């Protein structure tokens, strides 16, 4: 489409927190019952440094706060704490311009869209909604993320649905291995008011896409609530490393606990 221009571009300073013991996911799709299984994969090490930012979804007031482009490294654990679905997706690539292929995973209200193309992304990717007073409902009607998209190599549009426009914690793990972009996900209703919650929750495999591109950077996409005229969403990023993990499967197959072997001598003994 046509990118919306902002004369005043700023971004909030990054902040730091700790991964606690999150990011665990199922490496394989094998049913395992009441047993300890050991595997060496790209895991988020326990008590890992995490960088977290905010997604400002309302202006109240002519300053555009932009999301930063973050490294991808070997894979990312991306988490979001919000009440309404502010975080809508991400863009992945190396140059993030028309010179190279780029992946775009976005979730508009209708369905999820995943496209790998030679995108010419906007300076400020924009997703805008306005409140339909006569229908007492929000309707998203602005989608200006990329100015050009040519020589596409991937497209996938999920079946339509209606997204609802007590916080929610949505966790994802993104892993780009052997031409497959593997995504694992988990959703829990969290009661915390600020910061990443401490706890354990195994991420289930969401989907692996044979995109076959190189990814070194990515950026987060959020929604903007257009108002006539404070509780912004918060997202957290950690990086995976090749680690050997000892996962504990219960009688039903749920990963109840894990041990990071290389965390400390105690875990090595475990």
């Amino acid at each position: 489409s046509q990118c919306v221009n902002f004369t005043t571009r700023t971004q909030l300073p990054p902040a730091y927190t700790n991964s606690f013991t999150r990011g665990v996911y199922y490496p394989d799709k094998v049913f395992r019952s009441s047993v300890l299984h050991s595997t060496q994969d790209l895991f988020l090490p326990f008590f890992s440094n995490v960088t977290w930012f905010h997604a400002i979804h309302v202006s109240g007031g002519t300053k555009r706060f932009a999301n930063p482009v973050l490294p991808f490294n070997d894979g990312v654990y991306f988490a979001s704490t919000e009440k309404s679905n502010i975080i809508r997706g991400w863009i992945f690539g190396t140059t993030l311009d028309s010179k190279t292929q780029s992946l775009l995973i976005v979730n508009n209200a209708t369905n999820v869209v995943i496209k790998v193309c030679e995108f010419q992304f906007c300076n400020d990717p924009f997703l805008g909604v306005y409140y339909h007073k006569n229908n007492k409902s929000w309707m998203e009607s602005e989608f200006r993320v990329y100015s050009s998209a040519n020589n596409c190599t991937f497209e996938y549009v999920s079946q339509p649905f209606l997204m609802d426009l007590f916080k929610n914690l949505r966790e994802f793990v993104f892993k780009n291995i052997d031409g497959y972009f593997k995504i694992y996900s988990k959703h829990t209703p969290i009661n915390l008011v600020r910061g990443l919650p401490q706890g354990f929750s195994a991420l289930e495999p969401l989907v692996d896409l044979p995109i076959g591109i190189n990814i070194t950077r990515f950026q987060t996409l959020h929604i903007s609530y257009l108002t006539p005229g404070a509780g912004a969403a918060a997202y957290y990023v950690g990086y995976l490393q090749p680690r050997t993990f000892l996962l504990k499967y219960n009688e039903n197959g749920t990963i109840t606990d894990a041990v990071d072997c290389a965390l400390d001598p105690l875990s090595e003994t475990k």
Partner: antibody
Amino acid sequence: EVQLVESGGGVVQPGRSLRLSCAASGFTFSSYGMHWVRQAPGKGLEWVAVIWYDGSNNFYADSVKGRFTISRDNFKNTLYLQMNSLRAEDTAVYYCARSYCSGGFCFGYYYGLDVWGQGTTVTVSS
Amino acid sequence: SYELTQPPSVSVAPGKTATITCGGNNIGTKSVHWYQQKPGQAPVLVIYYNSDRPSGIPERFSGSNSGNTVTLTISRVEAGDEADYYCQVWDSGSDHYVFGTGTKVTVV
């Protein structure tokens, strides 16, 4: 004292150019997005172009794209429309109108063209 | 481009009401504005945000937008209401402000 004053219209042959003007007074000009809407004689309303409050964004109509240029001077409270390669189908009365910008956004969901100018007549004839 | 449909003419007796139909594609998702233009002068915004009246427009005018049925309503029609009425939206799918074809309201 909220008023919009168009000027610059005239009679012109096809191919020639013309620069329209719209002087605004009585309100905060830099808080509104400015439009051009033309009306051919005996015909309906046709939207021409829009420019946002600070001139950072502008959208044109397909019929005038590549020939018309919109601009604004915020320390003079004036809206402009440059019209090149004029054709007979550009004959109309040209109106300027304001619409409130929310908070850096002038899309037009919450506000419409609440104040219109008197208009200026443009005729393109051989 | 994005099409906005209106009936070309509507006739009503004084004191009765007139209904003007704005036809649009997925217009239930758009915010419709209405303009009154009496012959000889510039149009005037009479309904914005589907149903809001500006400060000076009398309460006889009202708009709706429910179930893909956007409608301008003028009750207690007077002879002074004889004008052309246009609906107007912002279509982000084409970066165009679109005006309807128009409706001439003559008072029988």
